[PDB]
Design a protein around this nucleic acid. Sequence first.
RNA 1: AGUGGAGCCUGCGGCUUAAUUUGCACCCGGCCCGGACACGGACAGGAUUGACAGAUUGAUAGCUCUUUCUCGAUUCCGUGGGUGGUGGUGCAUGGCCGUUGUUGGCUGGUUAAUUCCGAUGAACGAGACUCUGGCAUGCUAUUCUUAGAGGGACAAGUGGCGUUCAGCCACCCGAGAUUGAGCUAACAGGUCUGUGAUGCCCUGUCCGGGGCUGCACGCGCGCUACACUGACUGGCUCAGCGUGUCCUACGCCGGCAGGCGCGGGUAACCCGUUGAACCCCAUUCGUGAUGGGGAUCGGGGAUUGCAAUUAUUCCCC
Lengths: 49, 297, 81, 331
Amino acid sequence: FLRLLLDKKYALPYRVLDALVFHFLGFRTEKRELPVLWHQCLLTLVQRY
Amino acid sequence: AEFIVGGKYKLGRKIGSGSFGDIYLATNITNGEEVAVKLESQKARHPQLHYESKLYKILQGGVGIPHIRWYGQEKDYNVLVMDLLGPSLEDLFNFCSRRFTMKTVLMLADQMISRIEYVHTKNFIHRDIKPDNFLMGIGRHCNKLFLIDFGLAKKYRDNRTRQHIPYREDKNLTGTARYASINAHLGIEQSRRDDMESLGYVLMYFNRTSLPWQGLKAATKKQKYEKISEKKMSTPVEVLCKGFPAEFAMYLNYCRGLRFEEAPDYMYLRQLFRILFRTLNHQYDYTFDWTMLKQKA
Amino acid sequence: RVRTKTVKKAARVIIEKYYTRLGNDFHTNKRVCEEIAIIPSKKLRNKIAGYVTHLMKRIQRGPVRGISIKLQEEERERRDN
Amino acid sequence: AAHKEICAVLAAVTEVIRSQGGKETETEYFAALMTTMEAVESPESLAAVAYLLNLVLKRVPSPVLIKKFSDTSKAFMDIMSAQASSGSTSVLRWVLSCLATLLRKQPVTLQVYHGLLSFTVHPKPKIRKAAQHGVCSVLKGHPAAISTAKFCIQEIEKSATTTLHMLTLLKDLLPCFPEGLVKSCSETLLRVMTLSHVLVTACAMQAFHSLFHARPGLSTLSAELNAQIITALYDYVPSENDLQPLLAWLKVMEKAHINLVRLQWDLGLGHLPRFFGTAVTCLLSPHSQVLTAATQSLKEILKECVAPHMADIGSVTSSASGPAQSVAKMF
RNA sequence: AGUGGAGCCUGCGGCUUAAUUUGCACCCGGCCCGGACACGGACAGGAUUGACAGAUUGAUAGCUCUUUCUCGAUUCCGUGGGUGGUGGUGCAUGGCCGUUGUUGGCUGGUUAAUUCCGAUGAACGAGACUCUGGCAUGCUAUUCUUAGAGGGACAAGUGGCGUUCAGCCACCCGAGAUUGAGCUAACAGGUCUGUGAUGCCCUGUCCGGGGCUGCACGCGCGCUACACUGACUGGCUCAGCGUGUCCUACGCCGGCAGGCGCGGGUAACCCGUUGAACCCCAUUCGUGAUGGGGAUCGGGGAUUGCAAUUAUUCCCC
């Protein structure tokens, strides 16, 4: 839902952006292998915003 | 190891016993945050934990209610796991060597007024109000009081038709008689008026640090409760707060004379409490006696 | 101890061939297992001798008509060759 | 949720509620609740107090029961008449149960026994089963055996599905009967054996099994009566290969022969060769179960009824006269 | 003995057909839905949602055709050789089943019935795979050290427990009645929401009615006959393999199919001593497309099914 609703490409409020980047702050030192879909969500995020 | 609740919580040690269960500590194995456990046996005399779950999910959102974590059934038990909370008011009463001051009891009075406002705006009564029943927060909640133990709670008003539970006499004393009302002692149907009469009773318990009917002994439990009742009518209102401000006295007089279907003005009570608080020249700095004895160490 | 399939099979066929020349105790049975069978393994030789001894101590306790007709049948087979 | 609690009527009422006021027991509870028993027909309130009365009534207030048995008999009798006129089940069932308890613990008593007895033929199973079990508990816990035996005889002679019901009564109550009433009951039972209905035959063979299995004394059953009923039972032997009634017929004839040998051994050994010949003939049936049953029955009779008396009988030759000749015949 | 001849049925071809599905699949009508991305249009002046009533319809239906009331941004129109996603498909891939002993332990209605439905735990032990040691005053260059071979132990013997046979226990003798080494594993049966911007190929449902061989013909299976070694009527007298909660005894009514009632059978128990047909014994028939043969039709009755028309099946003329 992260990936597809970033693919909606709407006018993102910046508190929402702070919350999303705060989640990515939440992923600093975890070792568990997050999938290719994680990098797909990041790809859509850096492609849109 | 020996027992895992929820599939991701590891159980610890007992911290206390509830009205309808036992209270344990637990640690989440996924993220490490610490939770509190209410466990009850699936075959007992009072299967009321699902009603407690309903009352906790009703009371969500507002201040003074711990947020719901999980509920389930575990191989002989039903367990409802909640956010961790700190000690109750009686633990701080024991830690402070049995002495409370004016500023601290007005902080506690404002907090329990807010709690009673929240619970009667959420259409339910408590009927077991006691200093053990009101817990204290943890972390940034260290200045916020919390209300628990909906086991003896019941519905007192309807959302649609604005109707109360019909009045009927001969009701058994569900809560404790140290802070039970005269109407609760007689068997009159408990309402919000009896609730803040119990608030006044725990208030004078915090102020005087002793009760004249505390530790009374009689032939039986019913005789004890009855004797406490007629000595409660035998006790005048003003003599209970001698040497004290009359705010508590006329608060007790106001909450005593309330009717059944009336809606009390809680804004009036909060206004009077904050007027007394500012005329004794104190500020809301949250410096409690337990807090200052922590910094004194 | 248990006994394998090949021991009891070889024992049954060796009874059916040469019941006449056998004995009753472990000595005579291991002797005739030496001088009748190749049996390169001494361990399997001891096993086959023990189980044919068990077969002997089982079968002369039965009726003599079956053992008798086995004797003239084996004698007929031997005289035929 | 509230039946499984310890405080409920499941456990604690059976233990501590019987101690009424600290002493067990007082019928002042019942002496106060006549007012609910009279002029009130509210459901689930009469039934609950009847349930508690049934539960508490077993804790032996026996001299008080003997004293106010007249008051209880009249009260529960008017309850019986009113509830029979009204037609309820639960109140009637537990008032049957508590009258059964009262009659077990203790001229008018014959009337109360008749009132308890008359509700067996009541078509509701809950009423009928409770009445049957109550009558069985009263008789086995007797001067009232003649009356209930005559009632069962008249109830059979009056009548078809209730026939099996007081046949169940006869099955559960034949050992506690006097000898003449046993004879009359067996005559009526063979009278309903004149019919070809299967269920009545199987149930009354079960009644014979319960009669002879208990090993009754000489007062209940005599040796001559046993010989006569043994000779009468030879006339049916269903065909050869029915295997549901033939099993029961062999079993009851085995038990009757065992009881006859136990009463008078020489007559039993004298009557044995006919039964052994019929069993040998019945061994030609194609069913394996009847063959195993006949073998087991003859083995049981040989081990228990034939073996210990052979020192008394002695050696038998080809010219024996007494029971030795009977042994030679069944050989 | 036939088939190939004749009538009828059926199978492939072929022919007719809307279809006569094919190596309910077919036909005739009516519903329902059916990308985003890009760019250009309409949209609060209003995008769009819901709807009673009447109608079309084979029938009804805001799923359509009339007349306006309401929901309001939850939007809807067009063009792409650009992808594609509720797609199908294989590989590596992590978890999880099954797979290759022993002893315990009742409120309710309902029935003949402790009948029926309905609420309502424990322990104990666990390689039968391969090799092999203790004792040799024996053979070998040899009783004290050697290292090749040959012996010795096989549950062999005894007494109890034992399905009286598999096995168990204890014990004598014996050096040895079991002391040491090596060996968990395996999933071609798989399962389960995970991992590769993993290779590939693309971007239907329910309802009504019909047809499922309709028949000039070619090639084959079959059934009934062309009669006298036979057809008809009556009489007489004999099976077996199976199957059965639809097989059926028996009573009554009708001429028959059939109808009503009352019993048995979860079965070597009842149909059922399975009263079968050919066959046997008497009557009529007389070489006649005839009392052989029955196709195809006309009328009526009965039965199974929601429904028998294009003849479901049976009976009578």
